Each structure stands twice: as C-alpha cells, then as structure tokens.
Amino acid sequence: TDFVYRVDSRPPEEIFRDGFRSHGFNRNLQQHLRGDSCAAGSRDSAFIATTTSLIETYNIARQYYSSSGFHGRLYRYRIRANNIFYPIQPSVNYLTQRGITFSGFERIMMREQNEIVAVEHIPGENIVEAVELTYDRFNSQVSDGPGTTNARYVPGSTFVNPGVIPQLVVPTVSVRERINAFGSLISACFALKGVRRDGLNKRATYYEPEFYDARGVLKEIIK
Amino acid sequence: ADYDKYFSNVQINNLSYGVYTSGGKESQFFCIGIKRDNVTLPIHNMCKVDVFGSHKQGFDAMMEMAKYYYATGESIRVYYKENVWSDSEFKKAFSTNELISLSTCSSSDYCMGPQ
Amino acid sequence: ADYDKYFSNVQINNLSYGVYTSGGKESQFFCIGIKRDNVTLPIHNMCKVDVFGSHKQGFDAMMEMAKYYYATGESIRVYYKENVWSDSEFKKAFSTNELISLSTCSSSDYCMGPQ
Amino acid sequence: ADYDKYFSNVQINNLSYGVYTSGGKESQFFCIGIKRDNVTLPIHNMCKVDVFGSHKQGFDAMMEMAKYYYATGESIRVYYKENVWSDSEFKKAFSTNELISLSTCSSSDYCMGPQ
Amino acid sequence: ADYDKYFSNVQINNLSYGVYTSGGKESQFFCIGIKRDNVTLPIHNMCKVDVFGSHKQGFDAMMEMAKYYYATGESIRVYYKENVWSDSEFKKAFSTNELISLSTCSSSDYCMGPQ
Amino acid sequence: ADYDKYFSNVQINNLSYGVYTSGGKESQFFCIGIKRDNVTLPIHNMCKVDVFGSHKQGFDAMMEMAKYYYATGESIRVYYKENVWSDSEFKKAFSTNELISLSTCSSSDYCMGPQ
C-alpha cells in the first residue's frame, strides 16, 4: 500500500538481489538527518533514506547526469514499505520532549524531502521494479528509459510503521550543526553514498556532486 | 486580468538575472526556465523586465519567489503572458513570455490559483 | 479591530503570488492555502491585495511570515476578515477572505494572539 | 538611551504578526514570546508596533532578527522598554513591553550589548 | 547590449562586501571570486559598484543572486564587462571587471542566456 | 580608503541589533562579535550605526551579509576603522570600531580583498 523510491547506479540485476544496506547501526537520528552519519562524515548510519516523491527522484538524478564527470547509469527503484519503514515525524516528537531540539531550518529541510527511512536493510523482495533513467542534454531533461520488473518481488498489503523508531539514540550533546545537502535542497542521505556501495574494484571511482551546508542556502531564501 | 495561460505541476530548473542598456535606457531582467519531468514542454522560459525608474511591478517579489522555488525544486503552477519585448536577442535567448504569477502544487492534481 | 475570526492549529500548505491590472492600475496579490488534516477545510484561502504605488500596508511583511510558516509546515493560527474585493475574477479563485494575522501555536491548545 | 531592562539567555518560543485598525489608525505589529527553558518568567511578551504613515523605526530588521532566532531556537538577550500602546485590546493580548533590541548569547554567561 | 564576455560553468568560491570613500563621496561594493576546475580561468574577479545617491542599477538584486550561488556552490555562467573604475586602489584589489549578469547552468555545456 | 585594519580567518560568534534615540533623532545599530577559532581577539566588536532618515550607508546590505556568515559559522576577514561614536552608552558596550567590509576565506591563508 505505501510505496517509496530510491535512485541508484547499480543494475536491476544486483539490487533485486541485494537490496539496500545502511552504512552501519548508528541510530542517532539527528546525525543521519543532517547527512553526516549517512554521507558526509563517519558513514555509519542505521537508516536508509527513501522518498515518496517521483519528482524528487528526477531532481536527484539530474545532479549526476548534468555533470560530464558522471560515467554511470541511473535507475529509479520502486520499493514497498512495511513495518520497518518509518516516517520521521513521530520520532522527532519522541526526541523533542526528551530535550533534543530540531531547528526551524532543519524542519524546513525535512519538509522538502518527502522522506521515509528504513532501518538497516531493505530486502530485494520489497523492490517491485526498476526504471532506467535516460539523460538528454538536448533540452537537459531526464526521461524514463526501459522498465525492469523484479521477478523476485514479493506482493503484499503493508504500510509504513506509524510509530517511533525503536532504540533511538538520544544524544547528550545536542547542538546546531551543518545540514549536508546537494542539488535543490536534497538531503545528502539521498545521494549514492547514502547507502553501502560496492568496493571490490580498488581502482574504480564514480562521480558525486557538489555538497553544501543547507543553513546558508535556507538563510538566503528565508528573510 | 489574463490568467488564462499557465503550466501546472512544473519545476524551476534554471534562473537568470541581468542588467542591460537597450533603446537608450537602463533595464533589469530575470528569467526562469521550467521543466516537467519526462514530458517535453512547448514553452520553457518566462521573464520579467523592468526599466529602472518605472513604476513598481512586483519585480523583486516575483524574483524572490522564483529563487525560492528553484531552491526547493518544488512543484508549481506558472502563469504567463505573451509579451513582445524588443531587445530581441533577448527573445532569442529568453523568449517572448512574461511571467505573471507563481503558485504551489500540494498534489499532482491540485494547484492554487485561478483556473 | 476585528480579530474575532480565525482558525487555530492549522498549516499553510499552499502559496500563491501574482500581479494583475484592474481599472487601469496595476496590483499585487498573494494568498495562502491552509489545511488541518486529510480532509480539505471549508474555508482554506486568505489573500492580501496591494495596489502598486500606495502606502505601506505590511504586504511584504505578511508575505514573508506566510512563506516562513509554509516552509516549516508549522502549526499556526490564521486571522482573517471578510473582504469583498473589487476585481471578481479575483474572488473566483481566492474567495472573499482577507488575511490579517499569523501566530504560532506552541502546543495543540495555545496560540499567541487575541481570543 | 534606556537599555537597562532586559532578559538574558532566553529563547523565542512564539511569534505573532498582524495588521490592525484602532482609534482611526492603521498599524502593523509583531510580537515575540520568550521562555527560559520551560520556566515561564514574569514578562514573556515584547512587541513592536508600526503606525502606517510614521517614519522608519527598524520594524523589518527587528522582525527578521526575531524570525531568525525563533528559527534557530538560539539563546538570546531581549531588551525592552515600556510603551503603553493605544489599542486597549492590543495591550490585553501583548502587554505594554516594546522590543528595542536583540542580542545573541554565545555562552550561558555572556550576552552582547550594554549592561 | 554587450553580453559578449562570459565564463560558463564556474563557481563562486569567494565574496566581498564593503563601503569606501573616494573623492569625498561614499560608495558600496561587492565582488565575487570565481573558479573553474581543470579549465583554468584567465580572470577571477567581477565587481559591482554603487555610488550612494546614484540611481538604481540593480546592485541589490545582483548581490542577492551572487549570495545565493555562493551558498549553493552551483555551476553558473557569469557575464562581465570592462569598467576601469575611478578609485584605482579599488582595482589593485578587485581588478577592472564589472559583473552584469548571472545565469544557472542546467548542464556542463549548456547555460541559460545569450551566446 | 582605510582598509588597513582587518582580522583574517575569524568567525562571527555574536550578533546585536537595536533601535535607540539620542538627541532628537532615532538611530539603529548593528554589531558583530568575532572569534578566532578557540580564542578571543584584542578587538572583537564591530558596529554600524545609522540615523533614520540619514543618507544611505549600506547598513542593511552589511547587516544581511553578517547574518549569513553568522549563520554558516564560516571563516571570514573583517575590515574595520576607528570610529569613536559619541553616544558612549554605546562605546562601553561596543567600542570605537566600525565595521567597513566583510570577505570570505576560501582557504586557511587566503581571504579576498585588499591586503
């Protein structure tokens, strides 16, 4: 019933199989929502970002294809959410009368992501299909290429977990810090480096776009 | 007024601002480029032009909103008019469309504003 | 004044800004759309309208508060009054409600401002 | 000037903005609500009121600083003076404290400004 | 007009704003620093200068866009012209290039604007 | 001009804004407090003072730039000159230093601007 998305460079072949993995087991939610734990800093977040927004997936894809640096391909992956997918709001409430503060600017950021987080692992059997995204510089527009169906997909009438993320880390030192973003105020957790990547070929590299502090950008569009 | 022409559920994917002299006076302009993912549009460019010293026309307000929507990548509706400018390499670069109004889209089938 | 009409613990979920001409003079408008839950509210549109070249009426200040609350999705109280506009291919879209005041709601049963 | 009254190391936990008419005069105002980590001190309301047709008093700059600090939840110092406003209902909602200055507090034992 | 000189796909990596006096008169300026990786740039400075009390020349609008693009680190196109300024202590610091237009680059060999 | 005094690679760790009356005129002030990494500097306060209705001196543009760097915590260079204000209310709090220019530092030993 509740479906979500994630853009990735790895072939339908591979993630139908493997799914998506978090960097680690750190459940400091604020640290993940800042794109620190999941992307920019010590990559160890317990969470995998997904979005309910088709439009957002196209905005993510644009940030790679639009660079001559990016040699890969991209696919939009459609995923069925269930009792290990969580929306952030109930966890935020849970944290905020435990003294943890979320700034207005953080809440603006979160509100732009349409995000649902998954803990630790998203099995390949929750991934319905894959659509190859094609870039065209002719008019600089992203298009849907061929559509791949996961034969291994397991049907199901299941929705997002409406409660709080379990064993949430509640910090002793909550301060205001950089909000790592890219593109049009896209959280860094949505970038390729948001999940564990493949690393057996030690010579290989791939293109990540320009990241920035959202605090600066938000300061410039709010006043 | 004429709010009959518009595009629904589009995003701003480009911005432009500049100063120029044409026809003998100094002017201001800003342009937006719009897209609809996976769909080609007949029109991709809207501008607002302001000769310095003219009457207030909401140039700043419109420019600030456009920047705002470009920053969020938000879904919006864009209203435009046909405006034959006549610095015209301006039209070769920025087309003959005047941006008139910007509205948000809360869902893929509702946008605020006249319809 | 009349601060008797308002909706408490609401969110701004849509924005609209535009420029239009009526009666030979150019004007500005911006509107907010508000919501509470999954079901749409019977009164959900409030606007502020401004003729260019007039005195300060807090149009910009209001538009900026509204953008902020829209951006954060915060729970606020919205104050409005009944205003029969003068162009009415204007109430056609945005109703006859004029936006008058915005306040935050720190909890689900306290909002700042007159009651 | 008189900068002897203030509260240090407080947070803004409520905002209010509006336009109102009273006694034949039209005004715009904004008010802040302050707290000191959930202890709710004796005076928690400060406003700035701007009568249309009066001269610049730094209303927008003051309001934008307030909005910034409300957004960050930062610890600040708030300076105020007594100004008995003229709407009887306005003072009933917001008391007679006029916001005159805002300063940040870099630590729990230092705030910028006169002491 | 002359939109003949530009650098495509650059990023703003530095900003400068200030006030200075020359010839008994006061002005304000802002400058951007630009960089392009692997395609080295011959020129790294563009400025805009505004003599206080002169007529509107889009100083604030221009500065507003520069601040935004500096914040996002985005790739942009920058248009400039030669203006050997009046203070030549100014040119030893910021060179003789005047910023006239800023545009986004949707991709690495397409930028909005005239070519 | 006098750009001889500056501090490089500092961060803005405090802000101050206010309104006050002196003599017969109302003024506004804005000040920054600066830091260098782990330490306090012999001179750490810079202000800008503006009499309402007086000539444009770039008060708001300077104020907005400072707010941006305060928000990002960025390393910047701060240019100042000695200005003994004559409201000494003010000097006991903010010293005799006037902020004249702000610049970014793209690396730990490059800051834009005159040197």
Secondary structure of chain B in the HEC alphabet? CCCCCEEEEEEEEEEEEEEEEECCEEEEEEEEEEEECCECCCCCEEEEEEECCCCCCCHHHHHHHHHHHHHHCCCEEEEEEECCCCCCHHHHHHCCEEEEEEEECCECCECCCCC
Instruction: Work out the angle between the directed axes of helices D59-72 and F59-72 (0-180°, nearest 10).
Output: 0
- Quick one: closest CA in C to D60, which residue? C61
Three-class SS of residue C75? coil
- ∠ Cα D113 F30 A219 (to 5°): 110
Closest of A116, A120, A147, A130 to residue A15, by C-alpha: A130
Cα separation, B35 vs A139, in Å, equals 10
Cα separation, D66 vs A104, in Å, equals 13
Cα separation, B29 vs B45, in Å, equals 13
Q: Which of B57, B75, B104 should one mutate to test binding to chain C, selecting the residue with the greatest count of C CBs within 10 A? A: B104
Any bridge partners for residue F31, and if so which? F16, F47
* CB within 8 Å: C68 and D67: yes
User: What residue spans of chain E are helical by DSSP H?
Assistant: 59-72, 88-94
Q: Are D22 and C1 in contact (CB under 8 A)?
A: yes
> How far does A217 lie from chain F, in Å, by closest CA?
9
Q: Is the dihedral of CA D7, D10, D12, D14 positive or negative?
A: negative
Q: Is A73 left (phi over 0), alpha (psi -120 to 50) or beta?
A: beta
On whether any CB of chain A is under 8 Å from the CB of B38, the answer is yes
On whether any CB of chain C is under 8 Å from the CB of A104, the answer is yes
On whether any CB of chain D is under 8 Å from the CB of F18, the answer is yes
On whether any CB of chain E is under 8 Å from the CB of A138, the answer is no
User: What residue spans of D73-113 are helical by DSSP H?
Assistant: 88-94
Enclosing domain of residue A44 = 1-223
The pair of three-digit structure tokens given for residue C49, joined into one six-digit string: 């309208």
Cβ pairs bridging A and E (under 8 Å): 33
The yes-or-no reply on D/B contact (3 CB pairs or more, < 8 Å) is no
User: Domain tally for chain B?
Assistant: 1
Cα separation, A114 vs B25, in Å, equals 46
Work out the end-to-end distance of chain F between its first and last CA atoms, rounded to an integer number of angstroms.
13
On whether any CB of chain F is under 8 Å from the CB of E61, the answer is no
Closest of E73, E85, E84, E78 to residue E101, by C-alpha: E78
Q: Give the 3-state DSSP-derived string for chain F, with helices as H, strands as E and coil as C.
A: CCCCCEEEEEEEEEEEEEEEEECCEEEEEEEEEEEECCECCCCCEEEEEEECCCCCCCHHHHHHHHHHHHHHCCCEEEEEEECCCCCHHHHHHHCCEEEEEEEECCECCECCCCC
Cα separation, F45 vs F14, in Å, equals 9
What's at A213, amino acid-wise?
Answer: D
The yes-or-no reply on F/D contact (3 CB pairs or more, < 8 Å) is yes
* CB within 8 Å: D72 and A222: no
Residues 6+ apart with CB under 8 A from B103: B76, B77, B79, B111, B112, B113, C14, C15, C16, C17, C18
> For residue A77, what is the domain's CATH number?
3.90.210.10
Closest of F36, E74, C97 to residue A210, by C-alpha: E74
> For residue B111, what is the domain's CATH number?
2.40.50.110
Residues of B in contact with A143 (CB under 8 A): 38
- ∠ Cα E34 E36 E41 (to 5°): 75
Any bridge partners for residue A72, and if so which? none
Q: Give the 3-state DSSP-derived string for chain A, with helices as H, strands as E and coil as C.
A: CCEEEEEECCCHHHHHHHCEECCCCECCHHHHHCCHHHHHCCCCECEEEEECCHHHHHHHHHHHHCCCCCCCCEEEEEEECCCCEEEHHHHHHHHHCCCCCCCHHHHHHHHHHCEEEEECEECHHHEEEEEEEEEECCCCEEEEEEEEECCCCCCCCCCCCCCCCCCCCCCCCCCCCCCEEECCCEEHHHCHHHCCCCCCCCCCCCCCCCEEEHHHHHHHHCC
> How far does F27 lie from chain E, in Å, by closest CA?
19
Of residues E58, E112, E115, nearest to B28 (C-beta) = E58
- Other C-beta atoms closer than 10 Å to the C-beta of F42 total 5
Residues of F in contact with D102 (CB under 8 A): 15-18
Specified resolution (Å)? 2.3
Residues 6+ apart with CB under 8 A from B36: B7, B9, B10, B11
Residues of B in contact with E106 (CB under 8 A): 13-14, 33
Cα separation, F71 vs F65, in Å, equals 10
Method by which the coordinates were obtained: X-ray
Enclosing domain of residue B50 = 1-115
* CB within 8 Å: A140 and B13: yes
Of residues C64, C67, C73, nearest to A111 (C-beta) = C73
The pair of three-digit structure tokens given for residue A89, joined into one six-digit string: 């709001």
- Other C-beta atoms closer than 10 Å to the C-beta of F49 total 21
Closest of A30, E17, A222 to residue F66, by C-alpha: E17
> How far does D112 lie from chain A, in Å, by closest CA?
20
Cα separation, D33 vs D94, in Å, equals 9
Cα separation, A109 vs A140, in Å, equals 26
- Other C-beta atoms closer than 10 Å to the C-beta of E49 total 22
DSSP label at E52?
T
Three-class SS of residue D77? strand
Q: Are F36 and F11 in contact (CB under 8 A)?
A: yes
CA A198 from centre of chain: 17
What's at D38, amino acid-wise?
Answer: N
* CB within 8 Å: F101 and E21: no
Q: Are A61 and A7 in contact (CB under 8 A)?
A: yes
Cα separation, A100 vs B30, in Å, equals 42
Chains sharing 3 or more CB pairs under 8 A with chain A? B, C, D, E, F
Q: Please report, for chain E, how many H helices and E strands are present, in that order.
A: 2, 5
Q: Is the dihedral of CA D7, D12, D14, D18 positive or negative?
A: positive
Q: Cα–Cα distances in Å, from D51 out to A42, A88, D56?
A: 53, 43, 10
Cα separation, D6 vs D46, in Å, equals 11
Q: Are D16 and C103 in contact (CB under 8 A)?
A: yes
